[PDB]
Enzyme design. Structure first.
Site, PDB file in Angstrom:
ATOM      1  N   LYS H  41       5.944  -7.860  29.538  1.00  0.00           N
ATOM      2  CA  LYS H  41       6.133  -9.204  30.077  1.00  0.00           C
ATOM      3  C   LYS H  41       5.759  -9.264  31.553  1.00  0.00           C
ATOM      4  CE  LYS H  41      10.375  -9.049  29.045  1.00  0.00           C
ATOM      5  NZ  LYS H  41      10.312  -7.688  28.459  1.00  0.00           N
ATOM      6  N   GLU H  67      16.394  -7.931  37.461  1.00  0.00           N
ATOM      7  CA  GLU H  67      15.342  -6.984  37.134  1.00  0.00           C
ATOM      8  C   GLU H  67      15.377  -5.791  38.086  1.00  0.00           C
ATOM      9  OE1 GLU H  67      13.315  -6.479  34.616  1.00  0.00           O
ATOM     10  OE2 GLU H  67      14.536  -8.037  33.677  1.00  0.00           O
ATOM     11  N   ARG H  68      14.368  -4.932  37.975  1.00  0.00           N
ATOM     12  CA  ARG H  68      14.319  -3.717  38.776  1.00  0.00           C
ATOM     13  C   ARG H  68      14.058  -4.043  40.239  1.00  0.00           C
ATOM     14  NH1 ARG H  68      11.596  -2.888  34.078  1.00  0.00           N
ATOM     15  NH2 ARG H  68      12.434  -1.252  32.717  1.00  0.00           N
TER      16      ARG H  68
HETATM   17  N1  LIG Z   1      -3.248  -4.704  30.063  1.00  0.00           N
HETATM   18  C1  LIG Z   1      -2.539  -3.583  29.910  1.00  0.00           C
HETATM   19  N2  LIG Z   1      -3.203  -2.413  29.804  1.00  0.00           N
HETATM   20  C2  LIG Z   1      -2.500  -1.289  29.649  1.00  0.00           C
HETATM   21  N3  LIG Z   1      -1.177  -1.132  29.580  1.00  0.00           N
HETATM   22  C3  LIG Z   1      -0.548  -2.305  29.687  1.00  0.00           C
HETATM   23  C4  LIG Z   1      -1.134  -3.548  29.850  1.00  0.00           C
HETATM   24  N4  LIG Z   1      -0.172  -4.541  29.923  1.00  0.00           N
HETATM   25  C5  LIG Z   1       0.957  -3.888  29.806  1.00  0.00           C
HETATM   26  N5  LIG Z   1       0.805  -2.534  29.655  1.00  0.00           N
HETATM   27  C6  LIG Z   1       1.855  -1.539  29.503  1.00  0.00           C
HETATM   28  O1  LIG Z   1       3.096  -2.205  29.492  1.00  0.00           O
HETATM   29  C7  LIG Z   1       4.084  -1.251  29.913  1.00  0.00           C
HETATM   30  C8  LIG Z   1       5.328  -1.986  30.336  1.00  0.00           C
HETATM   31  O2  LIG Z   1       4.925  -3.203  30.994  1.00  0.00           O
HETATM   32  P1  LIG Z   1       5.961  -4.079  31.792  1.00  0.00           P
HETATM   33  O3  LIG Z   1       6.568  -3.298  32.884  1.00  0.00           O
HETATM   34  O4  LIG Z   1       5.292  -5.375  32.217  1.00  0.00           O
HETATM   35  O5  LIG Z   1       7.006  -4.452  30.685  1.00  0.00           O
HETATM   36  P2  LIG Z   1       8.165  -5.522  30.516  1.00  0.00           P
HETATM   37  O6  LIG Z   1       7.933  -6.238  29.192  1.00  0.00           O
HETATM   38  O7  LIG Z   1       8.285  -6.398  31.687  1.00  0.00           O
HETATM   39  O8  LIG Z   1       9.445  -4.620  30.343  1.00  0.00           O
HETATM   40  P3  LIG Z   1      10.965  -4.595  30.800  1.00  0.00           P
HETATM   41  O9  LIG Z   1      11.713  -5.287  29.681  1.00  0.00           O
HETATM   42  O10 LIG Z   1      11.336  -3.110  30.844  1.00  0.00           O
HETATM   43  O11 LIG Z   1      11.110  -5.279  32.103  1.00  0.00           O
HETATM   44  C9  LIG Z   1       3.401  -0.457  31.020  1.00  0.00           C
HETATM   45  O12 LIG Z   1       3.878   0.880  31.031  1.00  0.00           O
HETATM   46  C10 LIG Z   1       1.912  -0.515  30.646  1.00  0.00           C
HETATM   47  O13 LIG Z   1       1.440   0.749  30.194  1.00  0.00           O
HETATM   48 MG   LIG Z   2       9.771  -6.334  33.009  1.00  0.00          MG
END
Ligand SMILES: Nc1ncnc2c1ncn2[C@@H]1O[C@H](COP(=O)(O)OP(=O)(O)OP(=O)(O)O)[C@@H](O)[C@H]1O
Ligand SMILES: [Mg+2]
Ligand SMILES: Nc1ncnc2c1ncn2[C@@H]1O[C@H](COP(=O)(O)OP(=O)(O)OP(=O)(O)O)[C@@H](O)[C@H]1O
Ligand SMILES: Nc1ncnc2c1ncn2[C@@H]1O[C@H](COP(=O)(O)OP(=O)(O)O)[C@@H](O)[C@H]1O
Ligand SMILES: [Mg+2]
Ligand SMILES: [Mg+2]
Lengths: 52, 52, 56, 345, 384, 169, 57, 345, 126
Positions: H41, H67-68
């Site tokens: 996300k 968040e972090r």
């Molecule tokens: N376009 C992309 N290419 C490669 N990896 C991607 C891409 N988009 C996202 N990722 C992968 O998504 C992983 C986690 O992404 P992100 O930190 O945005 O997650 P999140 O959904 O916000 O999670 P959280 O719930 O922990 O906050 C990263 O480790 C990355 O490897």
């Molecule tokens: Mg996140």
């Protein structure tokens, strides 16, 4: 066979010549219908919007 | 020559049938343009009236 | 002779395909069972939370 | 009391193929029509009324527990126009009424039926929906200070159900024959409210939405419906054998359909293919148009005798009709006219 | 808060309210005084169907009430703007209870609309009332009950939630002329009033076993099932012919529409069953081939674009074209263009028959003969 | 899921790989570090490249290949490379290795030196290479362990070391 | 020339010229059924209609 | 008030093929990113920030909710390094904070955004995680003496969410464009917290863990993502037809996958195999290299116009590129890059 | 009964697995064919009418008939009539043996030989 060939040639020529003309004329009719509908509904819409 | 009656019909029928489609398409484009321009003029009349 | 040999090859291919299909079914069953167990535990927990909450 | 009960299981004909065949009625017995919403309980009960209660030549009571007002009005006008209202008394508690009315309305009908019974008459008792009574009890229970149980039903669910059901019985002085529609929440027969009432009935007809999804009404499930009267001592050996044969054939087909769905029909034995064909024929033959549903179907209703039903199912179980298509039986009626539809198809 | 009319004051539902959708008007007729549930998952077109039903009433004389419970105000602005883009808004009442307003207002919102519709129903006029997301009303009532420390029942809902929706929905009814005369003290005589309700329920994952969906399904006179799979498959409106049912049925339809659609609905259901069965069989009997092809073409036929209601005559014509086998030779993709061309051709060349059908709705041997002649002439002369 | 939404990544250990004898059982595709290469030393960052994504693709390619295969040349190279690098990744417990010894085995992996060595010899090849480089190339190991830098000079040194070891195996 | 229905269907979908077909041997195929297509292919070959013949299996 | 609201249809272009193809969104609308833990996300939100800030010169507000802290520090530093910080107001209450800060922090960001809006500007609002607000409400609800509801959420869940969401609206005096990430607990899209949020948003992008495990990024699920703007009137006919064709092809692939799992692909009909082959190519083509993800993939990011994505998808569905392998489409910006990758396989 | 019932137990255990092969049992090892047509007949024999309890002598007799292969040539459709006829025959001509079995339930060579004679003599009839 000669009589059948000439009769069939004339029949199919007449039929195709009629049908293609009919198709093109009715395509012109449809074009005119769409044009008239658009022309009327443009002013219908404007007359609605001014009262709005 | 008798066997070309179907050939001679396909030389006319399907071509006219296809041409009817573009004939309708041009009228469709004209209709779309007419209605869009009518809306675009009506909005500019309405804005003028309300601004008055 | 060619016809007979093709029939034998068909039988061998069917044997192989049926082995693969049996393995696929065996792999599907365990995932379905895991999902079913998760649902089973969740339903018990939800209904007991409801029962306890209803004893206000 | 225990000493006053009677066991006069006189067989009763309804004119419906599946009900008469699989789940024969008995005079003085209790019948339950189980099903979810929109499976045909109301139209089945209307057809049953039109068949038996008109010919019954006796008083009848209709208890509209938690019914829709529109349907009650339509039923009253139907009874008036057919000029039989003079023999029937109606008690109505509609949905909009407060929970007390829906909770107690069934007991009023039971009291009227018991008054008629104690005179020594034979009466028919129709209950619109037993389930709504327990629902009214569940509504009131929480405010009454009782703790919840099971799926949020009142703890006294079984006690209330037994108290109401045990008054609907045929004593030595008079007989009460009752047909009760039982709502099945989300078609889950595991739910405690439908689960408990199962033990109180004598014949149980289960309507399944899975059959109803195919549009083949009456949508009675032959593999779940059952009746206490279906034993050789009552029905005779012919009827029992026919019913058991139909049950076994449908059970076998239910297994074979799983193979067919994925692997295809060519993987079956030719005898299994024949069984699938004849079972798929029987499944459609159980359908029957009711002339209380012409508004829905647009087709004339059919009435069938027990003997003709037996003969037709015997003929389909044997080779007499292997050549007719599956659609040739759908909503036909007697076997004697399925050939006509096959010719028309 | 008011009680619904009793048993003796009602009259049987035998009049049509036209949705303008081929699928709904054909398979699942709605009558004047019926309660028809619209049920389905999120983003499946539940609101679109109801607003199109409102749009179609602009010239039928039936007043419309749209009750918005718990929706965000911008969605209501868009809905009002769409109703105003057509002529429907002048015929419609909009009752709004946005998501921000207190739970009391949200839970009372349906009853206010019910009273406003009941105004017309008692004077002998027809009203159509749309309850949007009664599930949100149940949520607001659950909040109210829990804040009042009342004992929670199943799924944390209060026990009387069924009584709420049941007493709400039972107001929608058709009353006989005698009740109208009594209410109006003789000012209006000989006219029967009716209120038609179309509640909307959102299911989470198609799970109809939830408390509120079970209650609402028990109360209403039928349901229209919209589901995600058909919507993604391109079948829009995504009406599932199998699980959807109208308990009023043919009595609500005009004679011609009833005649045409009665076979259609069960034919489509059994076609879906056969297509499930036949999926891997190489050899199909010619009867089975007929059923499969006919079912595919009928499924293709019922798709319809948003905001484009069709008159009774046009629906009848298309259903006649489908039932009498004329669609058979046409390839599946051209079916839509076939329908459009047929509608345009009949509108330009055969307007009087369309007017006769729309006004009377009657059906006779000469009507069938004229329809057959129209179909033959179109299929010969015209091009899709 | 609550814990995953907090940390900066996860190392997922798969029971199937652990049973198969692939230990450590680190499952790529699911395992990820969200700080990424920024933590890595320059040399390790350069040599590691796309290893995790190559393994993630290979583990699905091997699952599909059991049923059927096409493009049997390139897919064959991908399969053998993936299998040999998985065999290279397995490491015994209580047996840590410095970045230097890690760097050179990755160099042998990605520069194609392991391409023609059979599976049953990968671990013995690795142990022999470590013992060999410990004997006389000690200054380069010390240099790598002091600074985790990468440049063409040590690139050529590693290439020559690999060539000489491959000659005298 | 075609043996078996699967080839019949596939090559009808492709639209290749199929001159002969035989189906429904199942298990225990018989040469007696095969005599036909080979007879017609021989007739084509020796009369000049065909110059080379292949068996595909 | 209801009177002040304003409608707008100006499509806002993004560099992301799948987002603006399947679920385009208009200036001043609401966008919601739904996903589990780790599906990406935050990366998608950062890419949206980078792309959208190009053509928007107004002010922006970023509100970090639960968040972090590390991500907040990184974002602040990268804003300062790019000298764009002076256009952004940052309100940060992170997970380390006690429940009150996480509960009330979002309202402060909303108040700043409303101040910027009432001045008559066009503002951009980004909420790092809207889910934490309801989570803080759940944490504090029990101590406030309120009975639990549903899955133990507070009874006022819907009102608490609605009162916050209703203030984020464009108005005739000024417009607010909003992007919100919505955490999905335990990947249960049916949980009450995600379920309530769905109705408040104009465009919803659903991220799936299963797709992310394939390595396809962004892991947008095209059969659940939807937007109010996917309407032939606004987007025009070609975009609408391409989107619906892609949706139907993928639905058919989902329908076939259950058969494929057991019997394998060989049993499929020749048109079904073509459907599968095209669906896999479509799934690969939806991937796109992000500029912010270069630290992960290494490969440089791509910006894709709407014209190029619609042309490429229409070409793929028409079958022009059926000769290319699947890998050709993986992680390519545009279709020309796809054909260039094909030459080297 | 303890002596006899192990045959039934193992016959049903074997029959359960072959039920999958029943659909296409035409192409099978003749040993498997025998096992299948034995399990099917045992399952057909185990069915019983309500309200008709069988004494230990009769259950032991029919179990002996099933286990010792006397049903090998009897058709699946006719098993019940065979059972009824056998019970009537033994009730008519050999009541003392049934009495002894009901009194003791013992088993030995002197009893197995008598049962063999019973079944051989019955098989000439019906
Ligand atoms: N376009 C992309 N290419 C490669 N990896 C991607 C891409 N988009 C996202 N990722 C992968 O998504 C992983 C986690 O992404 P992100 O930190 O945005 O997650 P999140 O959904 O916000 O999670 P959280 O719930 O922990 O906050 C990263 O480790 C990355 O490897
Ligand atoms: Mg996140
Ligand atoms: N017949 C149709 N043809 C094409 N698109 C349609 C049709 N009906 C609805 N849609 C589209 O489907 C989408 C959802 O429609 P709608 O808002 O009516 O759904 P809903 O079930 O009420 O949704 P929600 O849960 O958000 O209230 C919209 O993009 C709408 O334009
Ligand atoms: N035997 C039948 N013939 C035709 N339609 C039927 C039949 N049974 C049920 N239906 C359909 O089911 C709908 C609901 O039937 P009903 O019995 O009122 O539902 P419920 O069982 O919930 O009372 C009816 O509108 C009718 O169209
Ligand atoms: Mg009913
Ligand atoms: Mg909606």
């Amino acid at each position: 066979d000669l009589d059948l060939a000439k009769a069939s040639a004339t029949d199919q020529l007449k039929k195709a010549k009629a049908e293609a003309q009919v198709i093109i004329e009715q395509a012109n009719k449809r074009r005119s219908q769409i044009l008239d509908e658009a022309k009327a509904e443009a002013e219908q819409e404007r007359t609605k919007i001014v009262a709005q | 020559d008798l066997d070309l009656a179907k050939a001679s019909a396909t030389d006319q029928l399907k071509k006219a049938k296809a041409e009817a489609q573009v004939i309708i398409e041009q009228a469709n484009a004209a209709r779309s343009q007419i209605l869009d321009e009518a809306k675009a003029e009506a909005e500019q009349e309405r804005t003028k009236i309300v601004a008055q | 002779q060619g016809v007979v040999e093709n029939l034998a090859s068909e039988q061998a291919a069917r044997m192989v395909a049926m082995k693969a299909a049996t393995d696929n079914g065996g792999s599907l069953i365990k995932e379905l069972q895991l999902v079913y167990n998760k649902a089973r535990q969740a339903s018990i927990t939800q209904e007991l939370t409801e029962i306890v909450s209803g004893a206000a | 009391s225990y000493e006053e009960l009677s066991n006069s299981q006189e067989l009763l004909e309804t004119g419906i193929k599946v009900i008469d065949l699989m789940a024969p009625f008995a005079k003085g017995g209790k019948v339950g029509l189980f099903g979810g919403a929109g499976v045909g309980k109301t139209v089945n009960m209307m057809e049953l009324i039109r068949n038996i209660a008109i010919e019954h030549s006796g008083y009848s009571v209709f208890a509209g527990v938690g019914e829709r007002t529109r349907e009650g009005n339509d039923f009253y006008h139907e009874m008036t126009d057919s000029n039989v209202i003079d023999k029937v008394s109606l008690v109505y508690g509609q949905m909009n009424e407060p929970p007390g009315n829906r909770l107690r309305v069934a007991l009023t009908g039971l009291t009227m039926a018991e008054k008629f019974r104690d005179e020594g008459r034979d009466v028919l008792l129709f209950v619109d929906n037993i389930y709504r009574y327990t629902l009214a009890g569940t509504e009131v229970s929480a405010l009454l200070g009782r703790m919840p149980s099971a799926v949020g039903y009142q703890p006294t669910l079984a006690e209330e159900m037994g108290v109401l059901q045990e008054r609907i019985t045929s004593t030595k002085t008079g007989s009460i024959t009752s047909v009760q529609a039982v709502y099945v929440p989300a078609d889950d027969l595991t739910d405690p409210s439908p689960a408990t009432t199962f033990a109180h009935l004598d014949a149980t007809v289960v309507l399944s939405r899975q059959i109803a999804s195919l549009g083949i009404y009456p949508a009675v499930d032959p593999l779940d419906s059952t009746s206490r009267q279906l034993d050789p001592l009552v029905v005779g050996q012919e009827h029992y054998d026919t019913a058991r044969g139909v049950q076994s054939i449908l059970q076998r087909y239910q297994e074979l359909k799983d193979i067919i769905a994925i692997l295809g029909m060519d993987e079956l034995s030719e005898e299994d293919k024949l069984v699938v064909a004849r079972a798929r024929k029987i499944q459609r033959f159980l359908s029957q148009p009711f002339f209380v549903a012409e508004v829905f179907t647009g087709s004339p209703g059919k009435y069938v005798s027990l003997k003709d039903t037996i003969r037709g199912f015997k003929g389909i179980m044997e080779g007499e009709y292997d050549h007719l298509p599956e659609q040739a039986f759908y909503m036909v009626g007697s076997i004697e006219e399925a050939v006509e539809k096959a010719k028309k198809l | 808060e008011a009680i619904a009319p009793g048993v003796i004051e009602r009259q049987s539902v035998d009049q049509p309210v036209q949705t303008g959708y081929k699928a709904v008007d054909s398979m699942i007729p709605i009558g004047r005084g019926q309660r028809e549930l619209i049920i389905g998952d999120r983003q499946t077109g539940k609101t679109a169907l109801a607003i199109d039903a409102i749009i179609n009433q602009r010239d039928s004389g039936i007043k419309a009430i749209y009750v918005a419970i718990g929706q965000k105000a911008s969605t209501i602005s868009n809905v009002v703007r769409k109703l105003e883009e057509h002529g429907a808004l002048a015929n419609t009442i909009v009752v709004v209870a946005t998501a921000s307003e207190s739970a009391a207002l949200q839970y009372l919102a349906p009853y206010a609309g019910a009273a406003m519709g009941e105004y017309f129903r008692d004077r002998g006029e027809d009203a159509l009332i749309i309850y949007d997301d009664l599930s949100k009303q149940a949520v607001a009532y659950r909040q109210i009950s829990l804040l009042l420390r009342r004992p929670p029942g199943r799924e944390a809902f209060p026990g009387d939630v069924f009584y709420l929706h049941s007493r709400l929905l039972e107001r929608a009814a058709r009353v006989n002329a005698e009740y109208v005369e009594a209410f109006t003290k003789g000012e209006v005589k000989g006219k029967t009033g009716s209120l038609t309700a179309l509640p909307i329920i959102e299911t989470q994952a198609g799970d109809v076993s939830a408390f509120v969906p079970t209650n609402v399904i028990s109360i209403t006179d039928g349901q229209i099932f919209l589901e995600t799979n058909l919507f993604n498959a391109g079948i829009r409106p995504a009406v599932n012919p199998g699980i959807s049912v109208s308990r009023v049925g043919g009595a609500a339809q005009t004679k011609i529409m009833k005649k045409l659609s009665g076979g259609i609905r069960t034919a489509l259901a059994q076609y879906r069953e056969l297509a499930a069965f036949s999926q891997f069989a190489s050899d199909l009997d010619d009867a089975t081939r007929k059923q499969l092809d006919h079912g595919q073409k009928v499924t293709e036929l019922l798709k319809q674009k948003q905001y484009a209601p069709m008159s009774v005559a046009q629906q009848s014509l298309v259903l006649f074209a489908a039932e009498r086998g004329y669609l058979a030779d046409v390839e599946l993709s051209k079916i839509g263009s076939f329908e459009a061309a047929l509608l345009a051709y009949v509108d330009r060349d055969h307007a009087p028959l369309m007017q006769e059908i729309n006004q009377t709705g009657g059906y006779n041997d000469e009507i069938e003969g004229k329809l057959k002649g129209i179909l033959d002439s179109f299929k010969a002369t015209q091009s899709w | 899921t609550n814990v995953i939404s907090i940390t900066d990544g996860q190392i997922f250990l798969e029971t199937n790989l652990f049973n198969a004898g692939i230990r450590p059982a680190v499952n790529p595709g699911i395992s990820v570090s969200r700080v990424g290469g920024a933590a890595q030393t320059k040399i390790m960052k350069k040599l590691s490249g796309g290893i995790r994504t190559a393994l993630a693709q290979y583990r699905e390619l091997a699952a599909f290949s059991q049923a059927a295969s096409d493009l049997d040349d390139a897919t064959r190279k991908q399969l053998d490379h993936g299998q040999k690098v998985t065999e290279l990744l397995k490491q015994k417990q209580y047996a840590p290795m410095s970045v230097a010894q890690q760097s050179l085995v990755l160099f042998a992996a990605e520069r194609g030196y392991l391409a023609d060595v059979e599976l049953s010899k990968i671990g013995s090849f690795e142990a022999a290479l470590l013992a060999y480089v410990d004997r006389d190339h000690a200054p380069l190991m010390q240099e790598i362990n002091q600074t985790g830098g990468y440049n063409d000079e040590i690139e050529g040194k590693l290439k020559g070391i690999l060539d000489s070891f491959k000659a005298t195996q | 020339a075609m043996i078996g229905s699967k080839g019949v269907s596939f090559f009808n979908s492709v639209g290749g010229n199929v001159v002969a077909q035989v189906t429904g041997m199942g298990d225990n195929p018989s040469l007696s059924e095969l005599i036909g297509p080979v007879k017609v292919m021989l007739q084509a070959y020796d009369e000049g209609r065909l110059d080379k013949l292949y068996i595909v299996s």
